[PDB]
Design a protein around this motif. Structure first.
Motif: not given
Lengths: 121, 121
Positions: B18-20, B30-31, B49-52
Motif C-alpha cells: 500500500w505504501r509503495l 489498488l482496488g 481493479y484497474d478500470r479496464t
RNA sequence: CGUACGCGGAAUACUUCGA
RNA sequence: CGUACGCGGAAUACUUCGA
C-alpha cells in the motif's frame, strides 16, 4: 428556515390515507422515501410514485446536483463533513455516502441509484 | 469455517505494498472494498481493479445471486434478518440493505450499484 | 492497506409503545 | 404513513492510538 436540497414539497400521506390505501391493496406503496443528509442535518421527502413514465419523470425532478450542492454548501467548513443520500422503496434501501469533497460524484451515484431503484421490476 | 458469499479470495495489500503504491501515485487506488452482511455476520473483500474491461469482468464475478443466497440462507430463521451489501470506491460508498425476504431484489440492486460504482468516470 | 477505540449522523432487521 | 425508545449490525465524516 434552512435551505432544502429538494425542489418538490413533501407528500407524506396522513395515517388515514395510508390505512385506506392498505385496505385497497406491499410492493405497491403510495410512494417512496428519500433523504439528504449534510453533517448533522437531514432533509426528507416521501413522494407519490405509480411506476409510470410520467411519474418517474416527475419524481426524478425532486432534486438536482445544483440544488443539492446549494443546500449542502451551507454546512461546509474547514474540515470535510459527511454527506448521505438514502432512498427506500419496496423493502429495499440504498444509501450513497461520502465526504463533502466528493459531493459531485455522490450526486451522480445517487441519481443513478434512484433511477434504478424506481425502475425495479 | 463459515460459507462465504464470495467466489474469489481476498486481495488486501500489505501495509508495505500500500505504501509503495502511494509513493507511485487518491482516485487511483489498488482496488475497492465490498462486503456482505447477514444478521450479525459480515464477509469482506478488497479486490484489485484497474478500470479496464478485463478487470471489471473479473471483479463482477466475485459473487452472484446464487452464491449470496447460499451463504445467507445459513443464517435464516423464524424471523427476518437484516442483509446488507456495501461497496466503497474512490471516496464514495453505496450500501444496499433490507430484510432477508427481499434478498433477491437486494442482490439485483447490489450488482447494479457495483457496476455503476466501478464505471464511474 | 490494516487494527482497537470515542463522538455525531445515518441505514437495515427484530420488538414494543404512542396518533 | 408518522412519533419516541431499546438492542444488534452496518455506513459515512472528523480525531487519535497501534503495525
Amino acid at each position: 428556515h434552512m435551505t432544502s436540497p429538494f425542489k418538490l414539497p413533501d407528500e407524506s400521506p396522513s395515517w388515514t390515507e395510508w390505512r385506506l390505501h392498505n385496505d385497497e391493496t406491499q410492493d405497491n406503496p403510495l410512494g417512496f422515501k428519500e433523504s439528504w443528509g449534510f453533517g448533522k442535518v437531514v432533509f426528507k421527502r416521501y413522494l407519490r410514485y405509480d411506476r409510470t413514465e410520467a411519474s418517474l419523470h416527475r419524481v426524478l425532478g425532486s432534486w438536482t446536483g445544483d440544488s443539492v450542492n446549494y443546500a449542502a454548501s451551507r454546512f461546509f467548513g474547514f474540515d470535510q463533513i459527511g454527506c448521505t443520500y438514502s432512498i427506500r422503496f419496496r423493502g429495499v434501501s440504498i444509501t450513497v455516502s461520502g465526504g463533502s469533497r466528493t459531493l459531485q460524484h455522490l450526486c451522480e451515484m445517487a441519481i443513478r441509484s434512484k433511477q434504478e431503484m424506481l425502475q425495479m421490476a
